[PDB]
Symmetry: D2
Subunit: 119 residues, 4 copies
């Protein structure tokens, strides 16, 4: 249920393959920020979720460097997949920038993205 | 040459990681705490061309807490930066999401912060 | 704008008064968790926000002790009051529990609550 | 043991009074950011904590407006007090700025501050 194309509330595009081993692989294209075109992502998911109708825990990382831009920063999304007719991946995220020590206190943004199958 | 190696956090967890030339992080994680035993697979990304102005190197990785022995139906992501030099450090904040029922989703996610050094 | 009765996505009820000095005062009733009836809250807001279409920054705290229950924990909500389709307060929150030192790594839950004035 | 002056790892100064009803009142002075002099804070704490060595849960808020300056932002610290010879207040915090709706995705910084008595 995880493999495919997903879209968040900003209009970003998350293209992922869930491997049998628990691997997540794919690309991310952000609608916002210091970003253009696609970025590599990798992550992990629970390949044997609870069979009580609980979500499937997962997470992935993008480092914001590709052949076009380098924003010296990385986002991790941590969340859970919920299947069915309105399938969703509900996440919270941490976006850490490379900073000097003096500016480390303001290195990290936090937010929340909800992914669905329709934009 | 800096990130690759064996790291330990303030809890005594062990983070064995290899930084690829392509920006990949690969390795294993063993937690000293929680619903975990032995090693778990990790993967992540890092900035392979960091600034040269004294800024840290941004990185992140994920562990799903399923291995051959146990499954805690949960995943942690660590987001942070590597700080080079004589006492190299990886300073992170993390999000640990559990798979929940819809009605318990409000309490799905723990947050914390881990600092790693190469000292056992 | 801020003064009034708000409801989040869980059906919790946030009754607040925005004072002229930047004070927030009122009560919170959670629909979920180790909580019953109303709890005291206090907080602060920007009493001279920008006039460029930006939101109004604010935050508040509830300690989960009242006359009925004590959950040995406190939540802070940090967010902004916004206009748009309807009046809304968009937050992220941190819920810290009092823990032993050994359990402090799992002391803090994180989430996000959006409030409107619409009674469910 | 909460009432008094506390200092974090940035060199900021947290002056607080813990009232018998669970109130926190005081002033905060940040060593960093868009901040000058002292700001009002208010918050709440667990006035009947467990007696098993567990910390005392608490939180407070600063809106970054005072008579000198206005940074159109607010920080909330959520954490626990731990007493004893090496007393600490261990926190995580959320700093939200007032933004346009288009910029709301980047409204909020997160971090962690440890306060000590010394
Ligand atoms: O702007 C960047 C990179 C792009 C971040 C895009 C973010 S990821 C979380 C959120 N969900 C999305 O779909 N899009 C946004 N980095 C900055 C450099 C300095 N500070 C940080
Ligand atoms: O306990 C678990 C899995 C193990 C987490 C270990 C955590 S990762 C962040 C922190 N840093 C470490 O080095 N260790 C801890 N998951 C639970 C199931 C129910 N809720 C959640
Ligand atoms: O369950 C509690 C107290 C009640 C928390 C209710 C939370 S506040 C954030 C969210 N938004 C709401 O409107 N309701 C929930 N505390 C536990 C002791 C053990 N761990 C934690
Ligand atoms: O710089 C500001 C206000 C000052 C924040 C200081 C922060 S509070 C958390 C941390 N712990 C401290 O003791 N100091 C720092 N606000 C900005 C306007 C734009 N974005 C954000």
């Amino acid at each position: 249920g995880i493999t495919g194309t997903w879209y968040n509330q900003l209009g970003s595009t998350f293209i992922v393959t869930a491997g049998a081993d628990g691997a997540l692989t794919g690309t991310y294209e952000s609608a916002v920020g210091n970003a253009e075109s696609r970025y590599v992502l990798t992550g992990r998911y629970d390949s044997a979720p609870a069979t009580d109708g609980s979500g499937t825990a997962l997470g992935w990382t993008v480092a914001w460097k590709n052949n076009y831009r380098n924003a010296h920063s990385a986002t991790t999304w941590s969340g859970q997949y919920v299947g069915g007719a309105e399938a969703r991946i509900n996440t919270q995220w941490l976006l850490t920038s490379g900073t000097t020590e003096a500016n480390a206190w303001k290195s990290t943004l936090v937010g929340h993205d909800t992914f669905t199958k329709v934009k």
